[PDB]
Design a protein around this ligand. Structure first.
Ligand code: HEM
Ligand code: ANN
Ligand code: CL
Length: 393
């Protein structure tokens, strides 16, 4: 009934080029069994969307990594939002939704845009740069920690902690065990910055603590909710921006369209999120026997959702492996879908938009002029190094 596959979606071979294996997973059936890790897999858009939008049947409180929290201890205390189900999910989600709200974006937009324009100006003085370290990493690090309200000391822990979080969703392979092996100093820094005295006035962290007044969260809930914004956000946005630059370098016709109409910057970034899907996968756990695409899955089974694959499913997308900055991207699952859909998506889109805006207005050409190196992570897809020459407009 259900095809059994030996593909390891967390292998370095898979990470290096996942797209042929993703078609194999899609075309084998709507539901596959992955013998390597004893989980079910869904790689077509339809089933990924269906799983995401039934949180009662496909829960997150038993972990959204391979590990089942009913069988193993979580490597860190569970997230109050990502690793919770309704109704426990609802009030922390509402707090983060207000902290990162449409109205909040107005207070940070001008500074985020200024930093993006300034970074592109700086990179044009150098000409030949690494669009990962010097741009995709450098830009978010120049705006988001300040917007959190973090002190300057210790910020070198932020990228290692994010990489650890996303490796820890994976199976117990060497990527995950090595990350946890090295985790203690990053864990200690992050947990300490979550305390109210260490979050500067007016930033995201202080705003979370300010909500402990309303009855939506208690003061003892606020540190772990701050932890959510020190786990999420950085690595995905870095990878998304790097993907966008990569695409503009590989598809010069799309850079030319973007230069011709810089108001396409926001959709250019959204299309990069669909095309690269920085978050490749998330798990759910069944809370009952369930019929999914003609297959019967038992209770307490892990279901692996291939978000990147769903975003390139030709059953849903015209020319899915073309980067098209005018594509109607509404419906892509790069930010998830449903009750858990990325609560920080307005922050991610703002960073991506103002960076692609600066490039659209200031750069004439982006040419790869060095070896492209991939970055390997159990959950994230992104580049390690992207040597480009930037030609000023
Ligand atoms: C391009 C950038 C980003 C991508 C691709 C991305 C991806 C995702 C995805 C796929 C989910 C769904 C998780 C699930 O369904 O289990 C999610 C949720 C979440 N994201 Fe993002 N994200 C991005 C940026 C951000 C930013 C900038 C922040 C914070 C400022 C953030 C914070 C969160 C949080 C806290 C959740 C949990 C929401 C919930 O469970 O209700 N993310 N993200
Ligand atoms: C989608 O990526 C993440 C990672 C961590 C968290 C969290 O720590 O709550 C949320 C989303
Ligand atoms: Cl931690």
């Amino acid at each position: 009934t259900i095809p059994h596959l030996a593909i390891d979606p967390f292998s370095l071979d898979f990470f290096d080029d996942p797209y042929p294996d993703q078609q194999t997973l899609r075309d084998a059936g709507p539901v596959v069994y992955l013998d390597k890790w004893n989980v079910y897999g869904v790689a077509r858009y339809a089933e990924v969307h269906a799983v995401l939008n039934d949180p009662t049947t496909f829960c997150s409180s038993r972990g959204v990594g391979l590990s089942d929290f009913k069988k193993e201890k979580p490597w860190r205390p569970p997230s109050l939002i990502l690793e919770a189900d309704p109704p426990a999910h609802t009030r922390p989600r509402a707090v983060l939704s207000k902290v990162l709200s449409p109205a909040t974006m107005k207070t940070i937009r001008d500074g985020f845009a200024a930093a993006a324009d300034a970074k592109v100006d700086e990179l044009l003085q150098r000409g030949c740069i690494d669009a990962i370290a010097d741009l995709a990493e450098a830009y978010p690090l120049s705006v988001f920690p300040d917007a959190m309200g973090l002190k300057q000391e210790g910020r070198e822990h932020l990228l290692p902690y994010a990489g650890l979080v996303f490796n820890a969703f994976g199976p117990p392979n060497e990527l995950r065990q090595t990350a946890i092996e090295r985790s203690a100093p990053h864990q200690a820094y992050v947990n300490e910055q979550c305390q109210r005295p260490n979050l500067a006035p007016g930033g995201f962290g202080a705003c979370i603590h300010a909500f402990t007044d309303t009855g939506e969260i208690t003061p003892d809930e606020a540190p772990l909710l701050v932890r959510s914004l020190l786990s999420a956000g950085l690595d995905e946005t870095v990878n998304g921006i790097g993907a966008a630059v990569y695409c503009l370098a590989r598809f010069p016709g799309e850079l030319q369209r973007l230069r011709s109409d810089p108001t396409l910057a926001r959709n250019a970034f959204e299309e990069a999120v669909r095309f690269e899907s920085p978050v490749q996968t998330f798990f759910r756990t069944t809370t009952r026997e369930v019929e999914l695409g003609g297959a019967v899955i038992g209770e307490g089974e892990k279901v692996l959702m291939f978000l990147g694959s769903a975003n390139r499913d030709p059953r849903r997308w015209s020319d899915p492996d073309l980067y098209d900055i005018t594509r109607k991207t509404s419906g892509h699952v790069g930010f998830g879908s449903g009750v858990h859909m990325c609560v920080g998506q307005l922050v991610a889109r703002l960073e991506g938009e103002v960076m692609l805006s600066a490039l659209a207005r200031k750069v004439a050409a982006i040419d790869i002029d060095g070896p492209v190196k991939r970055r390997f992570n159990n959950t994230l897809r992104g580049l390690e190094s992207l040597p480009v020459k930037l030609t000023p407009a």
